[PDB]
Amino acid sequence: TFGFLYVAGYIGYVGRQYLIAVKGEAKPTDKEIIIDVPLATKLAWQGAGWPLAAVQELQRGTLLEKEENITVSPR
Amino acid sequence: RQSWLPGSQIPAHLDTPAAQALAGNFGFDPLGLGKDPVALRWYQQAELIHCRTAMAGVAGILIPGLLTKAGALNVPEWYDAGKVAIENSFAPWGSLLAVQLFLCGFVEAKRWQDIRKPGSQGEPGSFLGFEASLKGTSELGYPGGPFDPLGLSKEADKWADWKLKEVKNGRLAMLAFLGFVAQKYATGAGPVDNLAAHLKDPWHVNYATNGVSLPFL
Amino acid sequence: KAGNWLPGSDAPAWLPDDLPGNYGFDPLSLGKEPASLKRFTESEVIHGRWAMLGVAGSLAVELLGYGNWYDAPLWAVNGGKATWFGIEVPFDLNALLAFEFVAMAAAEGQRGDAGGVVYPGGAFDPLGFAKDSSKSGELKLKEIKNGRLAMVAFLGFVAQHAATGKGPIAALGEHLANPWGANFATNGISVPFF
Amino acid sequence: KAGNWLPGSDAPAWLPDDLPGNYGFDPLSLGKEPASLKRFTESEVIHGRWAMLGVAGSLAVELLGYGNWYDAPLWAVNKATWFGIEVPFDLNALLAFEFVAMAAAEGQRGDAGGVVYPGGAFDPLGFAKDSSKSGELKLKEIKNGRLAMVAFLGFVAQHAATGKGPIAALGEHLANPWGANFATNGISVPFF
Amino acid sequence: GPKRGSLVKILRPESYWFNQVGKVVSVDQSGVRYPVVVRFENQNYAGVTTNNYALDEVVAA
């Protein structure tokens, strides 16, 4: 169970980082339909220390967003 | 500057006044774990403590271990001295570990309250005489007064060199300790013995011929 | 301020300073509200007093040599007789039960009649040692100190005897005979892997 | 200034000069703060006095021939006697007695803040009526105090090595210095 | 209203772009009730990327 948790957190984290990195560019739809190979490789190799990176982000309170999400009429 | 990898580019974060002014810097963080400065400072402190403790431990291993080859100071192996001393002991290992745990936790609490707020332990009256010298030396990780008792800090022209040799020898100590445990798993004998073996024959006394480090051959 | 409960720490705002034993210790932020905090004051003080009474009694019987605190209820939980300083008690278990019941009922109903008068004085201080208004605060602080101490002492009693089944006098005597052999670690119960 | 505690050295600033025995010795910079330094003053002086009392007593019994200081507690750890006059009272009795006595005396010492030189009734002989020779006597006092402290430490170290009365230690060194010394003790240095 | 090309934060509860941010195309200087015109980059459930709003409904952020 510990091995699986590690590898799954790895996959999820590198996915999140790719999404974020490609989100701040001039064609998100294009980067989502076609992949930047160098970007993919860089983010893959840097996905290693993902538990440390994530706990640091938590300690900075950055991984969670403030109350600015799209929201249905009642709440 | 001096880079662990010539030709390579410097990490974005690793090139800042603090980083270049920290210690032992060569632009080495290909995992970019220091893209945050607070985390970076915290990790500098961690690395400092590790360098110090690893230097202490590797000395305590090698020196008696080397002189047990000498006639005097006949001492058992380090990974067995636990058993040896607990046999020659006077108190139950439980109580021993408990008390040493308490006394380490206290000092760690002091260090930690400091790293939280630097001017924390200079609070007047919180002790009777401590706060006098219980104040940081403007560099988190270099307490003063009794710490540095021989006034080695009042000579700044040696300050940088002290810092640098400290971090270098500490990193070397960590590496040597890892070598120790790895070879005690692979071969299982005395480190000095592995030494003497590879010296009596380099070309065949090596992990390349341990049949374990590289199992597929 | 009784003192910085944690050197280098920072004081909590909801704690007014001049207060018997105000060390500033509430890192979990409980008494941030006034009515709750006053409730806490009264609870803590009466707890201190009752704790002190408890240790006084337990040590009394134990060192006077009438068994420990865990020994008294035996006479009634089985067949026997109530005894006090060697003077036995020729009355019923249920009698003393209902008696102490109505007594505590009256006393605490009185305590609750008025709102929160913790320091009655006057008739309840016929010796009158709070006539200073500053040394009064001194005595208040020393009081709450004694109270928190007696509370901790009682808890230690119950834990030691839950481990060893022994009178605290016996526990301290054992630690005297050998500390390295008579301790919660050597007790082997307070920590599992020992 | 009592004198340069280290020739060629430099004086520390936080040490005011005119002060009984101010040699200027604090190379580790401890008393740089006033309340702490005053605490140090009172600690040092009472330490000197108690040290002096200690050596007086130890030498008294030893050379009077009633065993050394390490010999007294034997009678109770397994009758109390004093100058040959025995003591017909309980160990625990004298324990609680000296306990409450020291409690009273030191609680008195703490009642007032820091009065170290009470005088008056506590100096009914009145030898500090000079205000300069008073300082002279203060300096000589602290000298005697630091000396007695060092003397006591020497006692405990010598007897922790040899298990012997200090009179015995000095007599041994007398009989042979080259053979009765901490080096020949073989304990104070390992590789000897 | 704010000059053209400025960026505001939609706040009309019903609006598909609610609690989001869009680029103001332009504002009518005249007195129409919803002179604000706001482009977007994420079409709603019908394929529209620009909506109109009154003054209050938006915040220039």
Q: Among D109, D119, D7, which Cα is nearest to D50's?
A: D109
Quick check: E11 and E17 in contact, CB under 8 A? no
Resolution of the coordinates, Å: 3.9
Which chains border A (3 or more CB–CB pairs < 8 Å)? B, E
Name the residue range of residue E15's domain.
1-61
Breaks in chain B at C–N > 2.5 Å: after which residues?
none
Quick check: B190 and B77 in contact, CB under 8 A? yes
Look up residue E10 and give its DSSP letter. Answer: E
Of A52, A59, A60, the CB nearest to B33: A52
B46 touches chain A (CB under 8 A): no
Which tokens belong to B91? 């108190």
Query: What domain count does chain E have?
Result: 1
Q: Do C186 and B95 touch (CB under 8 A)?
A: yes
Pairing of strands D85-87, D80-82: antiparallel
Q: Hey, is B215 helix, strand or coil?
A: coil
Q: To the nearest 5 percent, what fractions of chain C are helix, strand and coil?
A: 50, 5, 45
Residues 50-69 of A with CB under 8 A from B: 52-53, 56, 59-60
Measured distance CA(D64)–CA(C124) in Å, rounded? 61
Measured distance CA(B116)–CA(B137) in Å, rounded? 15
Quick check: E54 and E37 in contact, CB under 8 A? no
Measured distance CA(B41)–CA(B116) in Å, rounded? 12
Q: Do D30 and B133 touch (CB under 8 A)?
A: yes
Residue ranges of alpha helices (H) inside C26-167 are: 34-64, 74-77, 93-113, 135-164
Closest-CA residue of A relative to B42 is A56
Please name the method used to determine this structure: cryo-EM
C6 touches chain B (CB under 8 A): yes
- What Rg do the C-alpha atoms of chain D give, in angstroms? 21
C42 is in an annotated binding site: no
Map chain D to HEC letters.
CCCCCCCCCCCCCCCCCCCCCCCCCCCCCCCCCHHHHHHHHHHHHHHHHHHHHHHHHHHHHHHHCCCCCCCCCHHHHCCEEECCEEECCCHHHHHHHHHHHHHHHHHHHHHCCCCCCCCCCCCCCCCCCCCCHHHHHHHHHHHHHHHHHHHHHHHHHHHHHHCCCHHHHHHHHHHCCCCCCHHHHCCCCCCC
Measured distance CA(C177)–CA(C170) in Å, rounded? 10
What CA–CA distances, in Å, run from D74 to C20, D71, D137, D153? 47, 6, 39, 22
Q: Among B87, B91, B89, B96, which Cα is nearest to C191's?
A: B96
Spell out which residues of chain B touch residue D40, defining contact as CB-CB under 8 Å: 129
Q: Hey, is A47 helix, strand or coil?
A: coil
Of C3, C4, C185, the CB nearest to B95: C185
Quick check: B214 and B207 in contact, CB under 8 A? yes
